[PDB]
């Protein structure tokens, strides 16, 4: 190890008539990146480099609040609203695979140990014309572990939240925000898992329940109004105290599912299965400027 | 009590806050931290690793065939073999590399690039090439007498099948940026051209067509600034599994 | 110098005369699980010379059209000798691996094999939302081939596979590649029958070519488990 806060300086260089020495000749077959220095390939000047390296720290690179969940539901009277619809609440299994920016940024490593900072942002809208105003409603977000039973209705007795961690917040207030610790039963999360989570040869491939945090049950604590509204809840996740291990090649093809790494490219290049990089005329073609 | 007043920016949710929030689970003890191989603390460690360039962007190259260029024996002298558009913040032979991918998360960059080529022909195959780098300002060199005037290296295939072409940091500014304009002065890096120095001479029992694999890395004087949202990924709809929100 | 190398593990030895070096994954050597990292409280087994030794696989061959081959670890060794016996009788294991790939051709041959050890190579399917099934991942001593080696069969890029512990077999330079793998896992031990820590991929980035008379050119893989510990002894499973 070594502490590097700025980029490295360049040193003055001279003519070389070196016999037996070949700095530019290397061996990619060993698996080592070439150790040719710029002072050994050209004649350099003394440059004192003052460019920092702070913004590429994995703490800076990963600790940014990103949308992980966005769910809209209807705040009305659901007596005759028979469906799988979210009556006045929803359950969400916490994952970081539903939105592709944070997914691709997190999947640059094999293992990650971080604390999650969860921010909930709720907006409301009238269903319809006949606008009369937007209500200041109180919501409840109960954190329920992955292997625990969750509420089945909005007026359930499960929302009494004996020991389940719960937060009550208003729409007119700043967004709700809590910190979830590093919850894994292992020393790091597994962003990737080439195994099956059961013993009976038919578990899901690639997902172990050790790495899912839990469920998030959000309801409207108020009882329904005489008119109906549509309520959108957005969840944001911000990793902190991050540790990253074993970096990986980035995802080039578009994601298909949140359950697996299944791939289908784009119809044509770029980012197609046939071609990731867009095509050019020939290898002697340059999209360059003439005069 | 304390007399206070609220400032502009009060009750706002900036996604780069860096504050302390309320612990949802009190008295929680995380799993003891053990040693795992390959810990990363700076993405500049990652960008310094070699990575294949897709120099064969042609429609006649499919899949893996885009990761190598084929050399042949020519019947003329001083002929051009290939070009490499040095656009890092754009799409090209450098976009799907480690340095390119990680840099496209950022707006500004500085420092020297490292270009390595491995000769993957026969043992009985011989030749000399010249890999040139041209600073920005003009057209890509199409003759060797024009390319030899920039930063170049002549290299002969031998026991070391690899050579390195340093692309030095020759800029006016401390950083280069991205604004989607290729011919911008704050963005254009120059060109990389390969010519035949002598020829590719193979025996009649070796394959007459031989391949180069190009790699690109970054040196330890490389840096990046002003994180972006990576135009290399995106969705127009929700993914397959939506359970349950 | 770096071209001559002898690896001696147990009652097995490998000599190679046209080599490059050997790689230590992330610059780390396999060890035994220390006391400040242990979780299982029963005494481990540690069969040293009976398990720490080279095992050779089925020696695939490559012609024109080859896309590449992969083996999952320890899945590829779960039925070979005393290592595969200790795996069937114990519940937890922990091991590093010494991998040695062999490929010989004449001095009139081309070809560049990329030998990569990928940690936790979760695979994906092509044109399907259904996840890969059990028989798609668990192949055993015979391994599988790549459908789309360009994306490493998971939607990533083969060009960037050089952050993983890798070596090249360029036929004009060397005929062998050796990578030393330590224990890579989030847990100190693991069930060897439902999870693989490593996947060894050999990919022909440059095709095999020559104008001499054609021979069969096989690619052989020798794997030695290193510092094997086994915990949780019970009866054997099939």
């Amino acid at each position, epitope marked *: 190890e070594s502490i590097i806060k700025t980029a490295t300086d360049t040193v003055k260089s001279e003519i070389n008539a070196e016999l037996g020495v070949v700095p530019s000749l290397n061996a990619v077959e060993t698996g080592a990146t070439s150790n040719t220095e710029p002072e050994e390939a050209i004649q350099t000047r003394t440059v004192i480099n003052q460019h920092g390296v702070s913004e590429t720290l994995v703490e800076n690179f990963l600790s940014r609040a990103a949308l992980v969940s966005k769910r809209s539901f209807e705040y009305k009277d659901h007596t005759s609203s028979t469906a799988r619809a979210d009556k006045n609440f929803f359950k969400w299994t916490i994952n970081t695979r539903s939105f592709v920016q944070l997914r691709r940024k997190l999947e640059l490593f094999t293992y990650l140990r971080f604390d999650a900072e969860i921010t909930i942002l709720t907006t409301v809208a009238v269903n319809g014309n006949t606008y009369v105003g937007l209500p200041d409603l109180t919501l409840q977000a109960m954190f329920v572990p992955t292997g625990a039973l969750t509420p089945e209705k909005q007026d359930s007795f499960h929302w009494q939240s004996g020991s389940n961690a719960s937060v009550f917040f208003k729409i007119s207030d700043p967004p709700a925000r809590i910190t979830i610790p590093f919850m894994c039963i292992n020393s790091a999360y597994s962003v990737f898992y080439d195994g099956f989570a059961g013993f009976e040869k038919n578990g899901l491939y690639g997902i172990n329940p050790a790495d899912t945090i839990g469920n998030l049950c959000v309801r409207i604590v108020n009882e329904h109004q005489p008119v109906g509204f549509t309520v959108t809840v957005r969840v944001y996740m911000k990793p902190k105290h991050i540790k990253a291990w074993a970096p990986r090649p980035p995802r080039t093809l578009p994601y298909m599912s949140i359950a697996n790494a299944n791939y289908k490219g784009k*119809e*044509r290049a770029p980012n*197609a299965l*046939s071609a990731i990089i867009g095509n050019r*005329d*020939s290898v002697k073609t340059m999209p360059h400027n003439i005069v | 009590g304390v007399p206070t007043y609220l400032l502009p920016g009060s009750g706002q949710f900036l996604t780069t806050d860096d504050h302390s929030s309320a612990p949802a689970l009190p008295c929680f003890n995380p799993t003891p931290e053990m040693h795992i191989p390959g810990q990363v603390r700076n993405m500049l460690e990652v960008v310094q690793v070699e990575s294949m360039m897709e120099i064969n962007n*042609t*429609e*006649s*190259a*499919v*899949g*893996m*065939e885009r990761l190598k260029v*084929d050399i*042949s024996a020519l019947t003329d002298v001083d002929q051009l073999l290939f070009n490499i558009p040095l656009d890092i913040q754009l799409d090209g032979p450098l976009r799907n590399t480690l340095v390119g991918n990680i840099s496209r998360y950022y707006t500004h960059w500085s420092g020297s690039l490292e270009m390595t080529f491995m000769f993957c022909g026969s043992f009985m195959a011989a030749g000399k090439l010249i890999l040139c780098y041209t600073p920005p300002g003009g057209s890509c060199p199409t003759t060797r007498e024009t390319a030899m005037l920039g930063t170049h290296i002549v290299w002969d295939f031998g026991l070391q099948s690899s050579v390195t072409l340093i692309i030095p940091w020759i800029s006016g500014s401390h950083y280069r940026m991205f604004n989607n304009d290729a011919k911008s002065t704050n963005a254009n890096v120059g060109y990389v051209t390969c010519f035949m120095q002598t020829n590719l001479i193979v025996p009649s029992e070796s*394959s*007459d*067509t031989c391949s180069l694999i190009g790699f690109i890395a970054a040196k330890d004087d490389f840096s990046l600034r002003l994180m972006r949202d990576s135009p290399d990924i995106g969705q127009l709809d929700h993914l397959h599994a939506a359970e349950a929100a | 110098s770096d071209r001559v190398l002898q690896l001696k593990l147990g009652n097995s030895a490998i000599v190679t005369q046209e080599a490059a070096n050997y790689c230590c994954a992330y610059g780390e050597w396999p060890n035994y699980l220390p006391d400040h990292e242990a979780v299982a409280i029963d005494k481990p087994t540690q069969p040293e010379t009976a398990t720490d030794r080279f095992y050779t696989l089925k020696s695939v061959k490559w012609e*024109t*059209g*080859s*896309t590449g081959w992969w083996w999952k670890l320890p899945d590829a060794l779960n039925n070979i000798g005393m290592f595969g016996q200790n795996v069937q009788h114990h519940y937890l294991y922990r091991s590093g691996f010494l991998i040695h790939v062999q490929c010989n051709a004449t001095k009139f041959h081309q070809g560049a094999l990329l030998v990569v050890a990928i940690p936790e190579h979760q695979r994906g399917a092509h044109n399907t939302n259904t996840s890969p099934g059990f028989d798609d991942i668990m192949k055993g001593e015979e391994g599988g081939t790549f459908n789309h080696p360009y994306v490493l069969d998971d939607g990533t890029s083969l060009a960037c596979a050089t952050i993983f512990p890798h070596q090249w077999i360029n036929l004009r330079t060397n005929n062998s590649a050796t990578i030393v793998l330590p224990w890579m896992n989030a847990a100190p031990m693991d069930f060897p029958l439902r999870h693989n820590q490593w996947t060894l991929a050999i990919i022909p980035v440059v*095709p095999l*070519g*020559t*104008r001499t008379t*054609s021979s069969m050119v096989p690619i052989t893989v020798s794997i030695a488990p290193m510092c094997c510990e086994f915990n949780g002894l019970r009866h054997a499973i099939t």
Partner: antibody
Amino acid sequence: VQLVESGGGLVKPGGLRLSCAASGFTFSTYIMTWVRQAPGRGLEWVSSISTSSVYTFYADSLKGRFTISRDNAKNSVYLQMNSLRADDTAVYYCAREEGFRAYNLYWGQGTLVTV
Amino acid sequence: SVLTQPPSASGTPGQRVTISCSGSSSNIEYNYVYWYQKFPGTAPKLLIYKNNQRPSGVPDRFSGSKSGTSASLAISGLRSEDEGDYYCAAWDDILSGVVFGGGTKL
């Protein structure tokens, strides 16, 4: 630059190989295709094979009865039509692609395969 | 994923005929259109490539063009040798193959 095919004439459900041969160019840098004429029907592309022989393309009409091959050492390209039918009676030309898909500038002379 | 050509292009006294090609976003919208002529005993002969370009050996006739879709081949002279069977070819990304249209000119 120069292409010569070889094959034709056999019973209904049989099989055969066409074995075109190229001489005027490298042949390890181009994509070689097959195209049938099928008298009474118009031109229809049959198959393609890339330089590395890892990617093959196989017009969907014919399901799996054909298997395009390649030999960069002998500068030849083959079809190996399997489970022939009377519908497969055609003149089969081999072409050389010129750096773009479907861009064929040099063609073989054609071999009539009669089923 | 189909190219569509008119079966017949009559009008051979010395006029300028137009042969058309109908495609979709799979083949013509984003890929180059190639025009081949074909005679009952000769290998196909490329006339237009990359929607407008002529090979070396083709006369200044056979213009060829494309407007988003609906590629068009224009011949000027309708001579005795011009009698043939013209095909519109292009690569298809859905089918992952080449498709021809088929149309004989009288």
